[PDB]
Design a protein around this ligand. Structure first.
Ligand SMILES: [Zn+2]
Lengths: 57, 47
């Protein structure tokens, strides 16, 4: 569970959903997560870990 | 062992070229070559 609902979501806050939106309790983390939609604890699990990609140009 | 370069038979053209370039590491030369080939693109060591 988080510490902020879908209404009290301000700028520079975590937005990783927890639970089911069609459920009773559905909130977000709501922590210090500036310069990014998700938090630092979930930024490494959401995006592709170990980014290794390259091509020609 | 210092050098063998006179001014009558051999020239210092190859040695002088090492003082005009600012690239030292191989990655620097690779990035410069990639920028010269594909201009206007962020070069990476992998590509
Ligand atoms: Zn989160």
């Amino acid at each position: 569970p988080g510490s902020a609902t879908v209404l009290t979501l301000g700028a520079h806050m975590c937005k990783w959903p927890i639970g089911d939106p069609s459920s009773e309790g559905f909130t977000f983390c709501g922590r210090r997560s500036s310069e990014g939609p998700y938090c630092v604890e979930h930024a490494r699990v959401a995006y592709q870990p170990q980014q290794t990609k390259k091509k020609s140009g | 062992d210092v050098l063998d370069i006179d001014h009558v038979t051999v020239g210092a053209y190859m040695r002088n070229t090492l003082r005009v370039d600012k690239n030292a590491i191989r990655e620097d030369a690779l990035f410069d070559i990639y920028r010269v080939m594909r201009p206007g693109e962020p070069p990476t060591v992998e590509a």
